[PDB]
Amino acid sequence: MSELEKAVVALIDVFHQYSGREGDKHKLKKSELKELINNELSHFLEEIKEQEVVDKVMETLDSDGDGECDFQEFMAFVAMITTACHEFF
Amino acid sequence: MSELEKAVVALIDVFHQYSGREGDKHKLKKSELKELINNELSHFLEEIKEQEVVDKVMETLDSDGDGECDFQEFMAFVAMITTACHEFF
Numbered sequence A, B: 001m002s003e004l005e006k007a008v009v010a011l012i013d014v015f016h017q018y019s020g021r022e023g024d025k026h027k028l029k030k031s032e033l034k035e036l037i038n039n040e041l042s043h044f045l046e047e048i049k050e051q052e053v054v055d056k057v058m059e060t061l062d063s064d065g066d067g068e069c070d071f072q073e074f075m076a077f078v079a080m081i082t083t084a085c086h087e088f089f
């Protein structure tokens, strides 16, 4: 498989690594999202230590108002992060 | 770096591998998009052999009507592909 194909699989893997920990196994609740950011985006994003910081990230990500981040919402997060990395080149 | 972080970098790398070949170095024209699909998505997508097949993919991807796929439009493509892989689990 190509690097692109392996990357696609990695996006799916990391979502499930975190989404299945608690509650709805197909969505990231705030606690799971905090863990994902702190453990898997430690070189790109500042560590989240306060509940209000994760509340704000979830508010940005949660487009259907259920308080959790589903797979489509996670795709949008990944697009935001990748665009940020891509910029300040 | 985490698998997620490496995946983010791979998305950026593959875009530039193809976007810089011709014309606007920051966008994929149809010919570049065809090469990317055929060479980097050969396990996920059927090979594109006809101009009309790439025309249709570009039509789907091109949200600002310039006939090319920019980085944001490529992000949307990546989201489509990843969602497809994720489904039929």
Ligand SMILES: N=C(N)c1ccc(OCCCCCCCOc2ccc(C(=N)N)cc2)cc1
Residues within 6 Å of the ligand: A043, A044, A045, A046, A085, A086, A087, A088, A089, B009, B012, B013, B016
């Ligand atoms: N969140 C921040 N403020 C932050 C700033 C810098 C920083 O640096 C270390 C991370 C290194 C990431 C670079 C990996 C991929 O980078 C690129 C590759 C290609 C291109 C490009 N040609 N546009 C741009 C960036 C990390 C976090």
Ligand SMILES: N=C(N)c1ccc(OCCCCCCCOc2ccc(C(=N)N)cc2)cc1
Residues within 6 Å of the ligand: A009, A012, A013, A016, B043, B044, B045, B046, B085, B086, B087, B088, B089
């Ligand atoms: N385009 C097609 N029709 C097609 C169908 C099957 C096909 O199979 C070979 C590709 C193997 C891809 C699997 C890699 C990642 O897969 C998943 C991982 C986790 C999950 C999940 N738990 N949702 C789903 C899929 C390729 C192309």
Ligand SMILES: [Ca+2]
Residues within 6 Å of the ligand: A018, A019, A020, A021, A022, A023, A024, A025, A026, A027, A028, A029, A032
């Ligand atoms: Ca969950």
Ligand SMILES: [Ca+2]
Residues within 6 Å of the ligand: A061, A062, A063, A064, A065, A066, A067, A068, A069, A070, A073
């Ligand atoms: Ca939601």
Ligand SMILES: [Ca+2]
Residues within 6 Å of the ligand: B018, B019, B020, B021, B022, B023, B024, B025, B026, B027, B028, B029, B032
């Ligand atoms: Ca180009």
Ligand SMILES: [Ca+2]
Residues within 6 Å of the ligand: B061, B062, B063, B064, B065, B066, B067, B068, B069, B070, B073
């Ligand atoms: Ca365009």
